[PDB]
Each structure stands twice: as C-alpha cells, then as structure tokens.
Amino acid sequence: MIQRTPKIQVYSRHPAENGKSNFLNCYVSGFHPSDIEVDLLKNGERIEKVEHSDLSFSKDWSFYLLYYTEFTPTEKDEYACRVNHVTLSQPKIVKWDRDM
C-alpha cells in the first residue's frame, strides 16, 4: 500500500506576545492513509481542549488536518505537537519555536 509521511508544522495564528491570547496550531499535511493521532502538548502534557478541521485532501490525494486551541503564551510554558502515523516508527514531537 502507498504510505506518505505527515509534514508537521506547529505555530501560532498571530505573532506570539506573552500575556496575549492567541491560537496554537498543529498542521499536518501530505499524509496517507488518513488514520493519524495528533496531540497538542503543554509542558509535555496533552492539552484536552483541542479542536480539529474536517478531513480533506490535496490534488495528489494526500490528506491534511489542522489541530488547534486557544492559548496565552508565557515565558516558561513550552508547547509542542505529538504525531503518530503508520509511517512513523515512534511518535514524533515537534516543538513550538516562536522565533522563526
């Protein structure tokens, strides 16, 4: 069977400013098949209040999903996205880097 690996991006909707509410996004694209596990993490722990887009796909048939939550960034809090998929031999964690 065809398998395509998710391309994972973790980022804020707006430029991050400490103390200002924003949205944390994890966008996963380019993957096949559609079964995927995606979690947003705060200080290594799973965020419960997480929504996602309806499953859709690109021209090349590969799937994409946006996972997101409202958040207020601080100095100390670390955010990440954890993704598991048949193409990944273990879960992949991508850290939010606000200085890109």
Binding site: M1, K7, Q9, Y11, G30, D54, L55, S56, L66, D99
Partner: protein, 275 residues
Amino acid sequence: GSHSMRYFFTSVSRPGRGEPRFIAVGYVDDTQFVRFDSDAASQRMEPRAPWIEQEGPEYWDGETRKVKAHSQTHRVDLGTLRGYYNQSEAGSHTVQRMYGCDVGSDWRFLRGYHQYAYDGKDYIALKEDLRSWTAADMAAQTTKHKWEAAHVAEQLRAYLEGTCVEWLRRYLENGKETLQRTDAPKTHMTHHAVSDHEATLRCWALSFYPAEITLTWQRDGEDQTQDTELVETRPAGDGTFQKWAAVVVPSGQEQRYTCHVQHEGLPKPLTLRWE
C-alpha cells in the same frame, strides 16, 4: 479573479470495527462551506461557513439526502474494489473522490473534473472533454466499461457545466465579502545564526488569501530552488494562510540573497532584500 467549487469525499474501511467511516467536505476556493461525517451524531450535512447558513431547509434536507446516497455508494465501492484487486478483509482501504468546476474572472465555465483514487493512487478520472475516461490500471478499465455503458460521463457533464457553475456563482454572490476578497501577504525576512559561519534566512508571507502563492530565493539573481526549504502553505485558522521559505547561507553573504513573493493581492511582485 478565478474561482472553484470542489467536493472531497473519503471513505475508509474498518475491518471488524463496523461500517466504513465517510467524510465529505465542500469548498469554494480555499474556504470550506459544508461537511458531513458518517460517525457524527447529527447525521446531517452541516454548514461550515457563515454565508451558507442562509440556505433554506430544502437545501439542507436535500444535501443530507444526497450526501448519504454518496456515503452508501462508497460503502458498496469498498467491497467492489476488494473483489477487483482480490484483497482480503485483513486490512483497511481508502476510496477518495473529488469533483468540481473552475470559472474564470468573468465567472464563465473554464473546466470540470471528477476523479477517483483507491489507496492513495489514481483510479479513474473524467477527461477534460467531459465525454471520456482515463483508467489508471486494469481494474479501473472494468469501471470504465460499466460507466461507458451507463452513460455516466453525460450525466456528469450536464452537472459540471450547468448546475455546478450556477451554484458556484450563487455562493460567490452570497459570500461576496469572504469569497471575493484578496488579502495580500504581509511579508518580512528573519535572520538567525546557526553557527559562527552560517545563518538561516527565512522569507515569510502572512495573512494572505487565496492560498496560492509563490516564494522563491535568488542568489545574485540565480534561483536557489534545490537549496530552499519550502513549507506547505498552512491555514492561520482565521481564513488566511501563511508560508515560509528558508535558505542556510554563509555569514557575510546575506546581501547576495533576495526573496521574491508572488500573490494575486500584490499590485506587483515583491523583492525583499538584506540591504
């Protein structure tokens, strides 16, 4: 200027965990407006854009009826395809269908499409003439014979050229403030040393709509395409998109590098410089 309506359907079999999962979504351009999920409680076609909400009860009842019919067909298709490829019940499989229509800046019909994939590979596609089929392998030739004998292309052609374009025009009008807008990208570049001798240059485009954009790096005017990391265009969550492109360069050579941004909201393409 130009616009599209597209519907995307995904059905996934779930061996011994009940009936297949079916998800349908509809888009105008890069704006989703409807969804159906076979696993959800409502069992209704649901609005996903403010401007579709004004559609009447006949619209919602009829779209629910049709999307459920598509759901049942694709359930049958998953069994059919197992037969065509002599596959077992051990594994999950995926059918995908996309169809829709493109119009120009003058909103007249440009092209139609109607395509199917099985397990992530092309299966069968309506050709650009809307009269004939491209079948990707021998199993899809079986589908082609059946669809030709049943005059499926003629039915699709009448929809893609008539109904599809008429409803796209209606949505564009009703959703004019959302759909007939262009938000130009807000652009900048960032610079960060990765060592004492190299730096990452990252060219950003933010807050743009529609999602189509090109970002390219040049070094003394020569395209750096093999050395560029280009990420997939991603949604901000607010109806706009973001994208970046990066190169890693030797420190001191920054002024040789330029980033070039093309988007329909720009009065002219932009060149961003380090000097």
